[PDB]
């Protein structure tokens, strides 16, 4: 088990408030965030903000699947954004898929976290994305590739907090038993400790 | 869980916690900090800074300082805004926040029901706030506390208004900042800063106004000494 | 007022429904009432009524693998079941309630598309299962799944024989066969309160005040198909292991239900 | 006792008079609801026959009615609200409202700053005066001693208590704020 | 005009869903989990001035305008 | 939400400049903002940056049956789209009068010029033929969306490489990059758009204007003209009223500029092919500037996958087993059964009668 | 197929620089505030306009400096050989009506009707040849019928290029042949161009000659429509008195 | 195709068009009989007013939502008709259909002559009806049920609406039939549906088209439709009585 090549770039676009491109190996995702701004009166809520998430694919037009994977990202950002500090406003997170090579949802969650941090939004704790894909026998592989993903009988993806490493998001593909669900959860908890080190090292270097 | 007064000038991350000195104290947490129990929580990235003037009293506020573009109104800030409408007997002005502000026809110097001031749509105004809580649209008056407009009102006739990040504004508005003196050594200038991320400049020649506009946005970076003199010499031309 | 009132029953350990915080509502079903459909079943869960219907048609097999017959699920939430749904194109809740069922149908491998072909590469059966909710009280993804599984155990197809010189299809409407079903995926939903409280079989008001939701579906051999957690407070391995212990009993209950209703014919 | 359907012969115009939720035609009294038959004899004979369900799921507001509301947002010159209770009974849905800067006090006076009168999140008692325009639909009023904010809420989530006619104080932190206190 | 008797689908669609010891053990609530107020006067009984009433009765009685 | 309004000081400032023939960012009248191309890893994918605008182009092909009539060619979809992140204003269904003119500009240029050879994209006739489908996205709006979109589409189409097939007798077969090498396409010419803006009633013009210069302008003139000396489209629009010498001057300008742009594009594609053939490393990853603060590199890492067995084992072992109250099903009449607290009577009957 | 014989005659019998026959009419409808009807050659158009009125919807979509021109386009389902019915969502109608809105936001002297809308409707009953110029001329006539002031009399015509010569007022047979078509919208007094279009390839040396031939054919349309307007105004002046 | 649904096969021909069993023979009956009808009110719990109507092979469910925000001085009456895809010989497209809109309008022009909208200024009512199964006269069920729902939801109306249906035999001596079924409706030449107010004695809605061209048959079709609407009334009379007895006794 070994996480593959990682890369990230910040402040790409000049128009948004904060931009962040996060590519992990060959797959890549670009994201940008507009800060708290005005919101339509028909959608506004008092004592809280309103989150809007849109994802754009490369081939086709978004359908039921892409909005169903937009709900997970919105309900994940809803648990870490302090909306009570900014009522009667709107905060929107947009994720763009540039290239796909496997484990796209985890790289999208990491892109969203890095775009919100760069954009300067009050946060309670950072979050990460780890995807597991156990093979036809039970050999766990972390951060797999679409080559291994096609033959594998089950792929799981988890989102983990950055304080006590609890579970925030869980999307699973394939059928399995609980024992290897526990062992892939433990593998994800072990894997996030390096991603959080990449967050800390990137932000400590940024303010040098 | 580290302690304060030890991690000053250190980059912190959201979700981290820190221990203020022991005997609970009434020091108010700043923008990027929230007080929970007898501990402080971090909600913004940045660098811890502490300011107590001269004495062993309070004397002290905790606030992290970061780099961002989106502006949130703060009571007592000098903000440049642009008029948008003239509905009723007020002047809606766009400052850059979530909601537009609101002037009044009598807020200007010596303004009454007859000698109203001339304010068009799409003009920039220098003025200060008096209410900026998160319960209403912010409202700004535009002369003074006493009532004598000290350079306030409608400004800008032959200059350029551009936009920079909050970090450069914070850097320039410092008592130990030599940026303006050296930049004005090359090109004489006059500036009116705005805490919403706006700057008004006016050089002599249009070429100099272009150069000052481009070269001021890059002064947040490119640290002085080994770099600044050579950059100044190169741009002398 | 909102939170404290409910927590009065929570500390009392008897929620306003009159339940012990770890029990399900009353469940009843009927099968074989709509006579204009191949198969149908009505599921009642103490409100949260869902009805499903199956229609079989002919279609051309796909260009990649011409040995598969399509199955297409759809879940619709009309503006009459509740009062928050508005007319027009289907909304987010019904679309997610349909993508979830499509994912369950795919991962669970309940049916094999190779059992529906008549002659490879020209024509294959297609099943159109459409779900319409008659009442929205909470736990939608559980009763929709149970309605679908109950319906799929009643659909029966006629024996079709293709000629050689004529090459057309002659349907033998007298001898009608059945469908081959492999597994029986049953779902279970949990609602998590502010940071530690988990309840079973929630309600629309409770989901209105809850801070998260979890859904787990199990096979008949203790295998997990999907782990649907839309998000919220956060859980631990111990809490999931506590949930699956209840889900095992729920699955045994449901599998006994299906094993008993079909024998009664 | 017997119930009703929204049409049947009940009485003549001489043997009683129509009441609430009824109509008459051709000298007969006809039902217009499915409630219960109540005949209020009152005093003076000839009871005013009417039919009332007595289980109001919804009721349309009127020109004059007492309603319990809930503020949604406030502006420097008006304050949009949300009608929540029609007098006593709970309401299944929520309408919209607007409090102009003339209905705060019972004098229709100048000054009367809206900002410190109806802070968002409170629950108020108000009276309608009109059926309104398409911008503001019901035009509620609080120009009375019995109308105004009744149950406020603190800055940090604590049930408040009235302290004066114009001034309010926090019980926990002893903080001073301004409201429009209504008679209990 | 004879009315008829129901059938299965209708009699199941029209269902009304309305301590006895302890079961489902793990899902109880106990197993899964200074304030000196110095309160002011509790209400404010309005016994005092209430300006609107003042100004109204004031002017009506006064009735001088000088 | 909407876009920040335009003051009355910026208009004055741009117009005193333009009268004096000097612009904000230093470039003179007949200049472009320099360009920067970047190639993906799979074919038909590029990132172009004109000044500070970004467009992502990506080509992809697929095999369908060729309608009815035109039995010996292939079809070529296009779909421009404007991403909410390009600028605050762009909104999914509230900018429907720019999308149309943009899709049209793109389609008339690319499909009516006849530079792609859609003749030789057949396998059989009356049967499966390749249907290509170009796709562009706008990422960052800084003015001159169409020049960048056109250069992006050109490069993306001149970098694609199809699959490839064997056809002999009456039998098909489909290969893969390991069974057979992907094949390039055939491109007759390279039609490249140019835009001009007119200022204060045609008295001045400025080449390649950006978004502020776009809000102080009357109307726009676009002139698409492929290599050699052959014009392919023009579309005046906005608020302009034009002369006849000026169209010719513009045509000259577009000729010169397209010459230079084609130089650049050819050089960049050649260098990219040389890199791909030498055997070095390519892709979106090895493009991130390293002399810059916001880039970081980390080789692989086993984290420690030594403990997961033990933790999982103890967790499974340490929790309460399923309980053992089993429920009973009740039978009313074949077809309906109930489980739960149940109902008192067998069934309701004459409840109200 | 021959599109230009050696003698110089086209398919229908006219020379290179020869227009078709136009036959107009003013004042067709009564309920509306203006009307027109033109048949340029074998293409039958129609236009109806509605005068400055209150903005529909009142959704605060006004312009405090000028009026709001709103033009639509539709087409009958029997306008060509095949039925070819289309829904009211096609992008051809929107783009042609957007070029119509562009040219009439420049021809009309609109800074005289603050907070007002101008609704322009065009209906094509039979399309054979240039549809754009027939719609522009029919709506110029309908606007004149409505009394709306304008700077000049805008008129449009097309052209082409086959075998080294420039055509004029191309037809559908000639249009569907892959040639460098081109259209203008001219103001005769100043010679200014309100809109310019072209398609397919053409060398740069013949653009001046195609554009000149198109401008000349538009100036030739100008005189023919001018005599119609003068006869109409003299008709109404005779009627009045 | 559709970007808001699950995409399956592009085309799908149902097996009825390949059904090798030839169309059967309906039979004969007495045209002076009515299918027994059972009516229940107050079915749904989350709806302000609802009713479920079932008679023979017809299954229709109607629910009524209360007044909401937004001829004023009067309130609107929005309507929406939709039938279940699993009804009838073939499947139906979920997006909609011209037949559904025509029947929705034929409902709207029939339930407004009963309620008095001069009591709901600036408000509006929304009515939704669903047909679970089509086994006979349908428009004679979408009228009775949507009127029962209105009566149990406490809105003020002048009277109820009771519907019926008829069809014309295809023989050489055609005769109108009462309460036709699909076996007697797909083999018919014409059909008629009436909407009668039983007490006010006023026809609310009329619809009929077919091959009967003599203006002496339609007089009987209309007046036997009126006899049907006066014979279905007592069951709806006892249904609202039981509904109100139970709702009141539930307090």
From Swiss-Prot, chain C:
Subunit structure as annotated in this protein's UniProt entry: Component of the RNA exosome core complex (Exo-9), composed of EXOSC1, EXOSC2, EXOSC3, EXOSC4, EXOSC5, EXOSC6, EXOSC7, EXOSC8 and EXOSC9; within the complex interacts with EXOSC5 and EXOSC6. The catalytically inactive RNA exosome core complex (Exo-9) associates with the catalytic subunit EXOSC10/RRP6. Exo-9 may associate with DIS3 to form the nucleolar exosome complex, or DIS3L to form the cytoplasmic exosome complex. Exo-9 is formed by a hexameric base ring consisting of the heterodimers EXOSC4-EXOSC9, EXOSC5-EXOSC8 and EXOSC6-EXOSC7, and a cap ring consisting of EXOSC1, EXOSC2 and EXOSC3.
Record-level GO BP terms: exonucleolytic trimming to generate mature 3'-end of 5.8S rRNA from tricistronic rRNA transcript (SSU-rRNA, 5.8S rRNA, LSU-rRNA); nuclear mRNA surveillance; nuclear polyadenylation-dependent rRNA catabolic process; RNA catabolic process; RNA processing; rRNA catabolic process; TRAMP-dependent tRNA surveillance pathway; U1 snRNA 3'-end processing
Name of the gene: EXOSC8
Annotated keywords: Acetylation, Cytoplasm, Disease variant, Exosome, Neurodegeneration, Nucleus, RNA-binding, rRNA processing
Gene3D superfamilies named among the record's database cross-references: GHMP Kinase, N-terminal domain
Pfam entry (one): RNase_PH_C
Protein name per UniProt: Exosome complex component RRP43
The organism's place on the tree of life at top rank: Eukaryota
Family: Belongs to the RNase PH family.
Subcellular location as annotated: Cytoplasm; Nucleus; Nucleus, Nucleolus
GO cellular component, one term: cytoplasmic exosome (RNase complex)
Swiss-Prot record, chain D:
Recorded family membership: Belongs to the CSL4 family.
Residues with the Phosphoserine modification: 17, 94
A single GO molecular function term of this UniProt record: RNA binding
GO biological processes: RNA catabolic process; RNA processing; rRNA processing
Gene3D superfamilies: 2.40.50.100, Nucleic acid-binding proteins
Main location group: nucleus
Subunit structure: Component of the RNA exosome core complex (Exo-9), composed of EXOSC1, EXOSC2, EXOSC3, EXOSC4, EXOSC5, EXOSC6, EXOSC7, EXOSC8 and EXOSC9; within the complex interacts with EXOSC6. The catalytically inactive RNA exosome core complex (Exo-9) associates with the catalytic subunit EXOSC10/RRP6. Exo-9 may associate with DIS3 to form the nucleolar exosome complex, or DIS3L to form the cytoplasmic exosome complex. Exo-9 is formed by a hexameric base ring consisting of the heterodimers EXOSC4-EXOSC9, EXOSC5-EXOSC8 and EXOSC6-EXOSC7, and a cap ring consisting of EXOSC1, EXOSC2 and EXOSC3.
Entries under SUPFAM superfamilies matching the protein: Nucleic acid-binding proteins, Ribosomal L27 protein-like
Domain of life, per lineage: Eukaryota
Disulfide bond sites: none
InterPro entries for this protein: Csl4 (IPR039771), EXOSC1_C (IPR019495), Exosome_cplx_N_dom (IPR025721), NA-bd_OB-fold (IPR012340), S1_domain (IPR003029)
Coiled coil: none
Protein name as it appears in the record: Exosome complex component CSL4
Subcellular location per the Swiss-Prot or TrEMBL entry: Nucleus, Nucleolus; Nucleus; Cytoplasm
Keywords: Cytoplasm, Disease variant, Exosome, Neurodegeneration, Nucleus, Phosphoprotein, RNA-binding, rRNA processing
Any single Gene Ontology cellular-component annotation: cytosol
Residue ranges of every copy of the S1 motif domain listed in the record: 62-143
Species for this entry: Homo sapiens (Human)
SMART domains: S1
Curated annotation (Swiss-Prot), chain G:
Single GO MF annotation: mRNA 3'-UTR AU-rich region binding
GO aspect biological process, one term: poly(A)-dependent snoRNA 3'-end processing
Classification via InterPro entries: ExoRNase_PH_dom1, ExoRNase_PH_dom2, ExoRNase_PH_dom2_sf, PNPase/RNase_PH_dom_sf, Ribosomal_Su5_D2-typ_SF, RNase_PH
GO cellular component terms, semicolon-separated: cytoplasm; cytoplasmic exosome (RNase complex); cytosol; euchromatin; exosome (RNase complex); intracellular membrane-bounded organelle; nuclear exosome (RNase complex); nucleolar exosome (RNase complex)
Chain ranges passing through the membrane: none
Domain of life per record: Eukaryota
Keywords, ordered alphabetically: Acetylation, Cytoplasm, Exosome, Nucleus, RNA-binding, rRNA processing
Compartments reported by the entry: Cytoplasm; Nucleus, Nucleolus; Nucleus; Nucleus, Nucleoplasm
UniProt family annotation: Belongs to the RNase PH family.
Function statement: Non-catalytic component of the RNA exosome complex which has 3'->5' exoribonuclease activity and participates in a multitude of cellular RNA processing and degradation events. In the nucleus, the RNA exosome complex is involved in proper maturation of stable RNA species such as rRNA, snRNA and snoRNA, in the elimination of RNA processing by-products and non-coding 'pervasive' transcripts, such as antisense RNA species and promoter-upstream transcripts (PROMPTs), and of mRNAs with processing defects, thereby limiting or excluding their export to the cytoplasm.
Record-given protein name: Exosome complex component RRP41
Organism: Homo sapiens (Human)
Lineage: Eukaryota, Metazoa, Chordata, Craniata, Vertebrata
From Swiss-Prot, chain H:
InterPro entries: ExoRNase_PH_dom1, ExoRNase_PH_dom2_sf, PNPase/RNase_PH_dom_sf, Ribosomal_Su5_D2-typ_SF, RNase_PH
Keywords, ordered alphabetically: Cytoplasm, Exosome, Nucleus, RNA-binding, rRNA processing
Location of the region described as Disordered in the Swiss-Prot/TrEMBL record: 1-34
Disulfide bonds, paired cysteine numbers: none
Location of this chain's protein in the cell: Cytoplasm; Nucleus, Nucleolus; Nucleus
Superkingdom of the organism of origin: Eukaryota
One Gene Ontology CC term in the entry: nucleoplasm
Ribosomal protein is among the record's keywords: no
GO BP term (any one): isotype switching
Primary role: Non-catalytic component of the RNA exosome complex which has 3'->5' exoribonuclease activity and participates in a multitude of cellular RNA processing and degradation events. In the nucleus, the RNA exosome complex is involved in proper maturation of stable RNA species such as rRNA, snRNA and snoRNA, in the elimination of RNA processing by-products and non-coding 'pervasive' transcripts, such as antisense RNA species and promoter-upstream transcripts (PROMPTs), and of mRNAs with processing defects, thereby limiting or excluding their export to the cytoplasm.
Recorded family membership: Belongs to the RNase PH family.
Annotated protein name in UniProt: Exosome complex component MTR3
Protein source organism: Homo sapiens
């Amino acid at each position: 088990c070994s996480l593959r090549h990682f890369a990230c770039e910040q402040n790409l676009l000049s128009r948004p408030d904060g931009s962040a491109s996060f590519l992990q190996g060959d797959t890549s995702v670009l994201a940008g965030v507009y800060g708290p701004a005005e919101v339509k009166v028909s959608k506004e809520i008092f004592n809280k903000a309103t989150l809007e998430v849109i994802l754009r694919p490369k081939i086709g037009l978004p359908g039921v699947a892409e909005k169903s994977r937009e709900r997970l990202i919105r309900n994940t950002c809803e648990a870490v954004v302090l909306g009570t500090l900014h009522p009667r406003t709107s905060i929107t997170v947009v994720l763009q898929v540039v290239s796909d090579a496997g484990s796209l949802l985890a790289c999208c969650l990491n892109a969203a976290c890095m775009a919100l941090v760069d954009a300067g939004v009050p946060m309670r704790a950072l979050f990460c994305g780890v995807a597991c894909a156990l093979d036809s026998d039970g050999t766990l592989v972390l951060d797999p590739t679409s080559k291994q993903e096609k033959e594998a009988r089950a792929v799981l993806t988890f989102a983990l907090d950055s304080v006590e490493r609890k579970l925030l998001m869980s999307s699973t593909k394939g059928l399995y038993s609980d024992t290897e669900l526990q062992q892939c959860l433990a593998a994800a908890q072990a894997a996030s400790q390096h991603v959080f080190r990449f967050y800390r090292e990137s932000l400590q270097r940024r303010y040098s | 869980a580290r302690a304060a007064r030890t991690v000053l000038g250190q980059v912190v991350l959201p979700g981290e916690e820190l221990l203020l000195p022991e005997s609970r104290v009434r020091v108010v947490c700043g923008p990027g900090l929230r007080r929970c129990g007898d501990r402080l929580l971090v909600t913004k990235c940045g660098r811890l800074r502490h300011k107590e003037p001269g004495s062993g009293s309070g004397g002290g506020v905790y606030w992290v300082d970061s780099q961002q573009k989106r502006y949130v109104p703060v009571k007592g800030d000098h903000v440049i805004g642009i008029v948008t409408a003239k509905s009723g007997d007020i002047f809606k002005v766009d400052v850059g926040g979530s909601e537009p502000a609101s002037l009044s026809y009598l807020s200007f110097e010596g303004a009454t029901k007859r000698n109203r001031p001339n304010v068009q749509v799409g003009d920039l105004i220098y003025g200060q706030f008096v209410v900026a809580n998160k319960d209403m649209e912010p409202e700004m008056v535009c002369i003074d506390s006493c009532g004598r407009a000290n350079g306030m009102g409608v400004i800008g006739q032959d200059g350029l208004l551009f936009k920079v990040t909050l970090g450069l504004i914070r850097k320039l508005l410092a008592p130990d900042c030599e940026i303006i003196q050296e930049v004005g050594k090359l090109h004489p200038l006059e500036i009116v800063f705005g805490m919403n991320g706006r700057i008004w400049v006016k050089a002599k020649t249009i070429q100099q106004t272009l150069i000052l506009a481009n070269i001021l946005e890059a002064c947040e970076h490119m640290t002085s000494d080994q770099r600044k003199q050579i950059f100044s010499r190169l741009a002398e031309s | 007022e909102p939170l404290e009132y409910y927590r009065r029953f929570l500390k009392e350990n008897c929620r306003p429904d009159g339940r012990e915080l770890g029990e399900f509502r009353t469940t009843t079903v009927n099968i074989g009432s709509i006579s204009t459909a191949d198969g149908s079943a009505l599921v009642k869960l103490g409100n949260t009524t869902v009805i499903c219907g199956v229609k079989a048609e002919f279609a051309a097999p796909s260009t990649d693998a011409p040995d598969k017959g399509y199955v297409v699920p759809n879940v619709d939430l009309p503006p009459l079941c509740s009062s928050r749904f508005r007319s027009g194109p289907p909304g987010e809740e019904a679309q997610v309630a349909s993508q979830f069922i499509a994912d369950v149908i795919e991962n669970s491998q309940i049916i094999q598309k190779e059992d529906l072909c008549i002659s490879p590469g020209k024509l294959v059966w297609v099943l159109y299962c459409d779900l319409i909710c008659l009442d929205y009280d909470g736990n939608i993804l559980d009763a929709c799944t149970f309605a679908l599984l109950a319906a799929l155990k009643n659909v029966q197809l006629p024996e079709v024989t293709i000629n050689e010189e004529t090459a057309l299809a002659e349907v033998n409407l007298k001898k009608k066969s059945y469908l081959n079903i492999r597994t029986h995926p049953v779902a279970t939903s949990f609602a998590v309160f502010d940071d530690t409280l988990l309840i079973v079989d929630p309600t629309g008001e409770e989901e209105h005040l809850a801070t998260g939701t979890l859904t787990i579906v199990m096979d008949e051999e203790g295998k997990l198909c999907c782990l649907h957690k839309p998000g919220g407070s956060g859980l631990t391995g111990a809490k999931l292991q506590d949930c699956m212990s209840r889900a095992v009993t729920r699955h045994k209950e449901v599998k006994k239900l299906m094993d008993e209703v079909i024998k009664s014919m | 006792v017997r119930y009703c359907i929204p049409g049947e012969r009940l009485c003549n115009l001489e043997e009683g008079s129509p009441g609430s939720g009824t109509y008459t035609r051709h000298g007969y009294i006809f039902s217009s609801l499915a409630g219960c038959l109540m005949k209020s004899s009152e005093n003076g004979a000839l009871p005013v026959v009417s039919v009332v369900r007595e289980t109001e799921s919804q009721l349309l507001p009127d020109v004059g009615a007492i309603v319990t509301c809930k503020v949604s947002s406030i502006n420097s010159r008006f304050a949009k609200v949300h009608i929540l209770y029609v007098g006593s009974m709970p309401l299944k849905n929520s309408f919209r409202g607007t409090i102009r800067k003339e209905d705060v006090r019972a004098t229709e006076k100048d000054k009367v700053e809206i900002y410190k009168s109806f802070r968002p999140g409170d629950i108020v008692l108000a009276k309608v005066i009109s059926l309104g325009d398409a911008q503001s639909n019901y035009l509620l009023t609080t120009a009375e001693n019995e109308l105004g904010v009744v149950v406020a809420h603190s800055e940090s989530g604590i049930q408040m208590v009235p302290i004066s006619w114009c001034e309010m104080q926090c019980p926990k932190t002893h903080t001073k704020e301004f409201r429009k206190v209504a008679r209990v | 005009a004879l009315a008829a008797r129901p059938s299965a689908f209708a009699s199941t669609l029209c269902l009304r869903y309305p301590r006895t010891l302890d079961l489902y053990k793990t899902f109880l609530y106990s197993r899964q989990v200074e304030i000196s107020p110095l309160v002011a006067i509790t209400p404010f009984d309005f016994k005092s001035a209430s300006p609107d009433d003042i100004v109204k009765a004031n002017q009506k009685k006064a009735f001088t305008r000088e | 939400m909407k876009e920040t309004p335009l003051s009355n000081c910026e208009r004055r400032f741009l117009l005193r400049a333009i009268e004096e023939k000097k612009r904000l960012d230093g470039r003179q009248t007949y200049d472009y903002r320099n360009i920067r191309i970047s190639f993906g890893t799979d074919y038909g994918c590029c990132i172009v940056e004109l000044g500070k605008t970004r467009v992502l182009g990506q080509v992809s092909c697929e095999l369908v049956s060729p309608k009815l009539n035109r039995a010996t060619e292939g079809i070529l979809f296009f779909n421009l789209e404007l991403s909410q992140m390009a600028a605050p204003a762009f909104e999914p269904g509230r900018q429907s009068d720019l999308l149309v003119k943009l899709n049209r500009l793109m389609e008339r240029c690319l499909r009516n010029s006849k530079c792609i050879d859609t003749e030789s994209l057949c396998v059989v006739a009356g049967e499966k033929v390749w249907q290509i489908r170009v796709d562009l996205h706008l990422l960052n709006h800084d003015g001159n969306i169409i020049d960048a979109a056109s250069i992006a589409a050109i490069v993306a189409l001149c970098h694609f490489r199809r699959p490839d097939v064997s056809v002999q007798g009456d039998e098909v077969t489909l290969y893969t990059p390991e069974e057979r090498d992907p094949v390039p396409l055939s491109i007759h010419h390279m039609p490249i758009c140019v835009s001009f803006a007119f200022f204060q009633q045609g008295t001045y013009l400025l080449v390649d204007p950006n978004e502020r210069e776009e809000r102080v302008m009357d109307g726009l003139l676009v002139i698409a003209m492929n290599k050699h000396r052959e014009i392919c489209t023009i579309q005046s629009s906005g608020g302009i009223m034009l002369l006849k010498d000026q169209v010719l001057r513009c045509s000259k300008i577009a000729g010169v500029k397209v010459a230079e742009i084609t130089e650049l594009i050819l050089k960049a594609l050649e260098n990219d092919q040389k890199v791909r053939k030498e055997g070095g490393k390519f892709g979106f990853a090895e493009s991130i500037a390293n002399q810059r603060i916001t880039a970081f590199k980390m080789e692989k890492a086993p984290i420690d996958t030594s403990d997961v067995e033990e933790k999982a084992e103890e967790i499974i072992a340490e929790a309460e087993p399923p309980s053992e109250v089993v429920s009973t099903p009740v039978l009313w009449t074949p077809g309906t059964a109930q489980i739960g607290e149940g109902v008192e009577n067998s069934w309701g009957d004459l409840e109200d009668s | 197929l021959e599109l230009l014989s050696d003698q110089g005659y086209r398919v229908d019998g006219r020379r290179a620089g020869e227009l078709r026959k136009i036959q107009a009419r003013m004042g067709v409808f009564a309920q509306a505030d203006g009307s027109a009807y033109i048949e340029q050659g074998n293409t039958k158009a129609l236009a109806v306009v509605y005068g400055p009125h209150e903005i529909r919807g009142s959704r605060a979509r006004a312009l405090p400096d000028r009026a709001l021109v709103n033009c639509q386009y539709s087409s009958a389902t029997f306008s060509t050989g095949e039925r070819k019915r289309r829904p009211h969502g096609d992008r051809k109608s929107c783009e042609m009506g957007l070029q119509l809105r562009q040219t009439f936001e420049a021809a009309i002297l609109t800074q005289l009707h603050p907070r007002s809308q101008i609704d322009i409707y065009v209906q094509v009953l039979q399309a054979d040849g240039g549809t754009y110029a027939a719609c522009v001329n029919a709506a110029t006539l309908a606007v004149l019928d409505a009394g709306i002031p304008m700077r000049d009399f805008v008129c449009a015509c097309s052209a082409g290029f086959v075998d080294g010569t420039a055509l004029a007022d191309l037809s559908h047979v000639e249009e569907a042949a892959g040639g460098p078509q081109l259209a203008l919208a001219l103001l005769p007094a100043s010679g200014q161009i309100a809109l310019l279009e072209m398609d397919a390839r053409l060398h740069e040396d013949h653009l001046e000659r195609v554009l000149e031939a198109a401008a000349q054919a538009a100036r030739d349309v100008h005189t023919l429509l001018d005599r119609v307007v003068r006869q109409h105004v003299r008709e109404a002046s005779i009627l009045l008195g | 195709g559709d970007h808001r649904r699950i995409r399956g096969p592009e085309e799908s021909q149902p097996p009825q068009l390949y059904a090798a069993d030839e169309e059967e023979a309906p039979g004969t009956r007495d045209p002076t009989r009515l299918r027994p009808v059972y009516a229940r009110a107050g079915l749904l719990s989350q709806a302000k007013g609802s009713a479920y109507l079932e008679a023979g092979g017809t299954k229709v469910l109607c629910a009524v939502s209360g007044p909401r925000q937004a001829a004023a001085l009067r309130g609107r009456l929005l309507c929406d008709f939709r039938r279940a895809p699993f009804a009838g010989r073939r499947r139906r497209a979920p997006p909609g259909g011209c037949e559904e809109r025509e029947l929705a309008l034929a409902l709207q022009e029939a339930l407004e002559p009963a309620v008095r909208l001069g009591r709901y200024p600036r408000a509006q009512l929304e009515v939704s009806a669903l047909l679970l199964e089509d086994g006979g006269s349908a428009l004679a069920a979408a009228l009775t049920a949507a009127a029962l729902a209105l009566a149990d939801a406490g809105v003020e109306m002048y009277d109820l609406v009771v519907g019926c249906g008829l069809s014309l035999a295809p023989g050489p001596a055609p005769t109108w039939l009462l309460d036709p079924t699909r076996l007697e409706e797909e083999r018919a030449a014409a059909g008629l549906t009436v909407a009668l107010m039983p007490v006010l004695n006023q026809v609310a809605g009329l619809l009929g088209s077919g091959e009967g061209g003599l203006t002496e048959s339609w007089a009987e079709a209309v007046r036997l439709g009126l006899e049907g609407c006066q014979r279905l009334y007592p069951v709806l009379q006892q249904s609202l009585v039981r509904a109100a007895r139970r709702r009141g006794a539930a307090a």
